[PDB]
């Protein structure tokens, strides 16, 4: 309806509770493997944040897999930084990790992260 | 780390994508039954928004159920309004539905919704 009221902090409060479920390993339903490093997550949060995961988990065969192996070129630290961003809205971008984070965000099809990485690199040139 | 940057709209953008998955019936994993009316949802979103659903899906036996039956006193329209609020941050509160919405939010242990319902009722007295 047109007459709805809106609670400003609701979306942020939901994301904090989803990150608390991840931290306690509650109802996690997939393991992402990055060069023998394993990361547990919720398929729905991965799909909401990444074009690659949206395509994977909407596929009639892949939607049923409990393990997904990423390309061997992907850096585990870069993936870890992006997984934390998905669940918190906070991105730990540093001089020593920006190239690996940008390459990982391009592969995962995370448009806003790619755009910010490009702007931060352009400023140092 | 202390040096993180933050994307302001991220949490709202994630919630919109979770509501799009609900609308298309993608990766929904539970049916909530309210007096023979059925509602499909994601257990993680229900747990993030409700103290009752957090308790249900953290129970070692109930976490594995694909169907949950609510108390027969619960109004299906009141539940529908609250499920839409969970996935959007928007609450369709009207003179004709406020008593049913408040009773349903008390049962579901949704503290912010109960508090606002109480304030809107107090204003009309």
């Amino acid at each position: 309806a047109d007459s709805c009221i809106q609670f400003t902090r609701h979306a942020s409060d939901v994301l904090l509770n989803l990150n608390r479920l991840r931290s306690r390993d509650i109802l996690t339903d997939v393991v992402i493997v990055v060069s023998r490093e394993q990361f547990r997550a919720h398929k729905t949060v991965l799909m909401a944040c990444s074009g690659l995961f949206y395509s994977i988990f909407t596929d009639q065969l892949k939607c049923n897999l409990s393990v997904i192996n990423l390309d061997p070129e992907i850096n585990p630290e870069g993936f870890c930084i992006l997984l934390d961003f998905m669940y918190t809205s906070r991105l730990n971008l540093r001089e020593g990790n920006i190239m690996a984070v940008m390459a990982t965000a391009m592969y995962l099809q995370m448009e806003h992260v790619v755009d910010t990485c490009r702007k931060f690199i352009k400023a140092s040139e | 780390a202390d040096s993180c940057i933050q994307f302001t709209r991220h949490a709202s953008d994630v919630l919109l994508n979770l509501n799009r998955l609900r609308s298309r019936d993608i990766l929904t994993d539970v049916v909530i039954v309210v007096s023979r009316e059925q509602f499909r949802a994601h257990k993680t979103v229900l747990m993030a928004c409700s103290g009752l659903f957090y308790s249900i899906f953290t129970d070692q036996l109930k976490c594995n159920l694909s169907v949950i039956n609510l108390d027969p006193e619960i109004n299906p329209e009141g539940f529908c309004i609250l499920l839409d609020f969970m996935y959007t941050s928007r609450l369709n509160l009207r003179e004709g539905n406020i008593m049913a919405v408040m009773a349903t939010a008390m049962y579901l242990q949704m503290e912010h919704v109960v508090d606002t319902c109480r304030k809107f009722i107090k204003a009309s007295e």
């Binding site: 709805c4 009221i5 809106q6 609670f7 400003t8 902090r9 | 609450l91 606002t116």
Partner: peptide, 5 residues
């Protein structure tokens, strides 16, 4: 919190 969106 609550606002008119």
């Amino acid at each position: 919190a609550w606002v008119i969106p």
